[PDB]
């Protein structure tokens, strides 16, 4: 019977209560104070141009109807009471397929303070669009937004804001960082309104600032490109008579380089513009292709089929000697320009 007092209170709150009418309809504007505790920043999906994020989505708003006076100053209730009272219809403007967790019971807490204030937290895994510009890819940094506002209620109907200072209202747990290639820097929040034919709606924008970690694409892509770049010039070191040796060297290098170019592309969605890797791969494609033309030039002047034996014999080609030094030097200066260009 001790719980009967709390059951009796909950009956008085819901009777004569309308889930369709927002708090203070007409008489007042509804002010919703929202907070986010990002429990885990899910893996950014560059292929889908979206990102996953697992959050506790707190929302607080004053509702005069849900006012009580009992032994407990605050009622901690399960999700089942949330569906029977008005809650903001908050939706994520850039939100793709998103799932509200349900295991074991619905992961939503309702908490009604005696004054009337509510706290309505829910656990979500929202996949939101994060449009990306990949000119600097792989050494690119993005600011993925997460906009959320009411769907049916215009700026004069419900207005959102941050419970704490705006700086301290999006909290990311240190333990939870599920990013692999990206790295979270910080979170910046801003408020605005969005113009719609249906009306003017308030938005709560928050930008999660990310940065790619170049470490993966170094060993995965840049090093194999560099080895193929290195492998191409080894044919300069090999003697000129060994036509099959250098030929097999050069043709192998281009085919390997071509495979790397295709390999890099599938890591990213199709895009009209060429990323930074595409320029590194392209110029790497030039050195490997240029090396073959150097060998082809040597074959033009490789008059004597017979090699040197320890009559005339083939001398080491002048182009071969100069290609020995110029090519590694020309590639080295390029790396300094390339790496300095994008890293800084």
């Amino acid at each position, epitope marked *: 019977d001790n719980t009967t007092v709390f059951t009796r209170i909950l009956d008085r709150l819901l009777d004569g209560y309308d889930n369709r009418l927002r708090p203070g309809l007409g008489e007042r504007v509804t002010e919703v104070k929202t907070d986010i505790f990002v429990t885990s920043f899910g893996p950014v999906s560059d292929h889908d141009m979206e990102y996953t994020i697992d959050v506790f989505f707190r929302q607080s708003w*004053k509702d005069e109807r849900l006012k009580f006076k009992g032994p407990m100053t605050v009622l901690r209730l399960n999700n089942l009471m949330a569906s029977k009272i008005w809650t903001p219809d908050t939706f994520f403007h850039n939100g793709k397929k998103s799932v509200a967790h349900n295991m074991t019971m619905p992961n939503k807490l309702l908490r009604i303070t005696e*004054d009337g204030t509510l706290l309505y937290t829910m656990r979500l895994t929202v996949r939101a669009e994060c449009p990306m510009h990949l000119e600097d890819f792989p050494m690119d940094a993005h600011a993925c937004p997460l906009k959320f506002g009411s769907y049916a209620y215009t700026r004069a109907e419900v207005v959102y*804001e*941050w419970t704490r*200072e*705006p*700086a*301290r209202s999006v909290v990311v747990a240190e333990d939870g960082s599920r990013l692999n290639q990206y790295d979270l820097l910080g979170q*910046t*929040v*801003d*408020s*605005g309104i969005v113009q719609s034919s249906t009306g003017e709606y308030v938005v709560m924008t928050t930008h999660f600032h990310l940065k790619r970690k170049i470490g993966y694409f170094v060993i995965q892509t840049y090093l194999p490109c560099i080895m193929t770049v290195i492998l191409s010039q080894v044919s300069f070191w090999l003697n000129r008579e060994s036509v099959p040796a250098r030929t097999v060297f050069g043709v192998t290098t281009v085919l390997t380089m071509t495979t790397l170019s295709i390999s890099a592309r599938n890591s990213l969605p199709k895009v009209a513009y060429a990323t930074a890797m595409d320029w590194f791969i392209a110029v790497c494609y030039a050195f490997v292709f240029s090396a073959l033309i150097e060998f082809a030039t040597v074959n033009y002047f490789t008059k004597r089929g017979y090699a040197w034996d320890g009559k005339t014999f083939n001398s080491v080609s002048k182009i071969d000697r100069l290609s020995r030094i110029a090519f590694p030097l020309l590639f080295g200066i390029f790396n300094l320009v390339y790496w300095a260009t994008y890293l800084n």
Partner: antibody
Amino acid sequence: EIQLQQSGPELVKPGTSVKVSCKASGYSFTDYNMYWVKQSHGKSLEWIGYIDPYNADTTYNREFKGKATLTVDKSSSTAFMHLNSLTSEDSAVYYCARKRNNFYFDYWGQGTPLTVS
Amino acid sequence: YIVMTQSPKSMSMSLGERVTLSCRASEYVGSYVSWYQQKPEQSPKLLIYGASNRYTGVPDRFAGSGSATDFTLTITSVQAEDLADYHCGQTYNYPTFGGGTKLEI
């Protein structure tokens, strides 16, 4: 008609403690935080602290941490600031303000000049 | 905290004409920069809440344009009551106000 009326002007010698009371009239007191701002003559406005009247939680400026103590009396709808170890640097004008949004300090107090000798 | 600085410490201009006040923020503040007016022996009066929006009851001559860090308050036509000492606050983090620009003929 919102009107934040702070206490009258006073001046006490160094080493004493002084309390100034900020009184809210129109709006509901507990809904919005109450801030405290210090301004020396010919100087910028400096934040002291804010107190959420309902939970009575307080957050203080690092410089004024310990120097200033904020307490509230919801029954009278009055916010109190307590100062201790008064010095020459504490001679200034102490304002009271509310925060209606993350954007602006809607209504300010009348001001409460403080000087020491 | 975030440091707010106002470029023109004192601006001189007669009645009418255009007068623009600047206010830079040390780091990001979004659209949360407010502007306040304090004539001497008086409390501050809010003018431009948010980067651009104008508070109710303010004359329409007051206009403000904001960016990530650089913010401005411009008066299209100056009037006798317009001359005052202005302050630009921030609220994206714990509050911190600017040095305070002053106007006189």
